[PDB]
């Protein structure tokens, strides 16, 4: 059904979300769960689409969406998975966490349609 | 070209990208 949406209307969303499911299913097929890919996920993404991105606007938009999605994924969507808690949860005890996030992995479930 | 560059760290790569498509003609022949 066309009214269902989330098929072509949101090209940026579909283009970004596909990166998550495709890259995850690929690595789980190889190993199981690579994890640890905050900047890496965006990094390879940009390097893959940079050839089709002939306009600065596109890149800025793609990076905005990819970043927003990851940020949402780790919060609003809450489809992210982490091993520990005390090493990734700021405030309360006043954890350091100045280096980087311990373990970061995403659930292949999500809430997209496509 | 854009207001409030989201994630300057990831977007900084664009400052060099703009130069790339500047010296190299990407215009479809």
UniProtKB/Swiss-Prot annotation, chain A:
Compartmental location: Nucleus; Chromosome
Effect of residue 50 to A/D: Impairs interaction with CTD1
Residues annotated with Phosphothreonine modification: 84
Positions of post-translational Phosphoserine modification: 55
Post-translational modification: O-glycosylated (O-GlcNAcylated), in a cell cycle-dependent manner.
Assembly, per entry: Component of the MCM2-7 complex. The complex forms a toroidal hexameric ring with the proposed subunit order MCM2-MCM6-MCM4-MCM7-MCM3-MCM5. Component of the CMG helicase complex, a hexameric ring of related MCM2-7 subunits stabilized by CDC45 and the tetrameric GINS complex. May interact with MCM10. Interacts with TIPIN. Interacts with CDT1. Interacts with MCMBP. Interacts with DDI2.
Further remark: Early fractionation of eukaryotic MCM proteins yielded a variety of dimeric, trimeric and tetrameric complexes with unclear biological significance. Specifically a MCM467 subcomplex is shown to have in vitro helicase activity which is inhibited by the MCM2 subunit. The MCM2-7 hexamer is the proposed physiological active complex.
Family: Belongs to the MCM family.
Role description: Acts as a component of the MCM2-7 complex (MCM complex) which is the replicative helicase essential for 'once per cell cycle' DNA replication initiation and elongation in eukaryotic cells. Core component of CDC45-MCM-GINS (CMG) helicase, the molecular machine that unwinds template DNA during replication, and around which the replisome is built.
Name of the protein in question: DNA replication licensing factor MCM6
Organism per entry: Homo sapiens (Human)
Section of the entire sequence shown: 708 to 821 of 821
From Swiss-Prot, chain B:
Induction: Induced by E2F transcription factors.
Highest taxon listed in the record's lineage: Eukaryota
Localization annotation: Nucleus; Chromosome, Centromere, Kinetochore
Post-translational modification: Two independent E3 ubiquitin ligase complexes, SCF(SKP2) and the DCX(DTL) complex, mediated CDT1 degradation in S phase. Ubiquitinated by the DCX(DTL) complex, in response to DNA damage, leading to its degradation. Ubiquitination by the DCX(DTL) complex is necessary to ensure proper cell cycle regulation and is PCNA-dependent: interacts with PCNA via its PIP-box, while the presence of the containing the 'K+4' motif in the PIP box, recruit the DCX(DTL) complex, leading to its degradation.
Signal peptide per UniProt: none
Subunit structure: Interacts with GMNN; the interaction inhibits binding of the MCM complex to origins of replication. Interacts with MCM6. Interacts with CDC6; are mutually dependent on one another for loading MCM complexes onto chromatin. Interacts with PCNA. Interacts with LRWD1 during G1 phase and during mitosis. Interacts with NDC80 subunit of the NDC80 complex; leading to kinetochore localization. Interacts with GRWD1; origin binding of GRWD1 is dependent on CDT1. Interacts with KAT7. Interacts with ubiquitin-binding protein FAF1; the interaction is likely to promote CDT1 degradation.
Function noted in UniProt: Required for both DNA replication and mitosis. DNA replication licensing factor, required for pre-replication complex assembly. Cooperates with CDC6 and the origin recognition complex (ORC) during G1 phase of the cell cycle to promote the loading of the mini-chromosome maintenance (MCM) complex onto DNA to generate pre-replication complexes (pre-RC). Required also for mitosis by promoting stable kinetochore-microtubule attachments. Potential oncogene.
Disease linked to the protein: Meier-Gorlin syndrome 4: A syndrome characterized by bilateral microtia, aplasia/hypoplasia of the patellae, and severe intrauterine and postnatal growth retardation with short stature and poor weight gain. Additional clinical findings include anomalies of cranial sutures, microcephaly, apparently low-set and simple ears, microstomia, full lips, highly arched or cleft palate, micrognathia, genitourinary tract anomalies, and various skeletal anomalies.
Family as reported in the entry's similarity comment: Belongs to the Cdt1 family.
Domains as described in the record: The PIP-box K+4 motif mediates both the interaction with PCNA and the recruitment of the DCX(DTL) complex: while the PIP-box interacts with PCNA, the presence of the K+4 submotif, recruits the DCX(DTL) complex, leading to its ubiquitination.
Protein name (database record): DNA replication factor Cdt1
Included stretch of the parent chain: 413 to 440 of 546
């Amino acid at each position: 059904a066309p009214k269902a949406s989330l098929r072509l209307g949101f090209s940026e969303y579909s283009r970004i979300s596909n990166l998550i499911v495709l890259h995850l299913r690929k690595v789980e097929e190889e190993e199981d769960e690579s994890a640890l890919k905050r900047s890496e996920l965006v990094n390879w993404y940009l390097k893959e689409i940079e050839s089709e991105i002939d306009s600065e606007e596109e890149l800025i938009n793609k990076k905005r969406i990819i970043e927003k999605v990851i940020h949402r994924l780790t919060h609003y969507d809450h489809v992210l998975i982490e091993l520990t808690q005390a090493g990734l949860k700021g405030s309360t005890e006043g954890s350091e966490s100045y280096e980087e996030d311990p373990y970061l992995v995403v659930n292949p479930n999500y809430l997209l349609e496509d | 070209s854009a207001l409030k560059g989201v994630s300057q760290d990831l977007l900084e790569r664009i400052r060099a990208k703009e130069a790339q498509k500047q010296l190299a003609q990407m215009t479809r022949w």
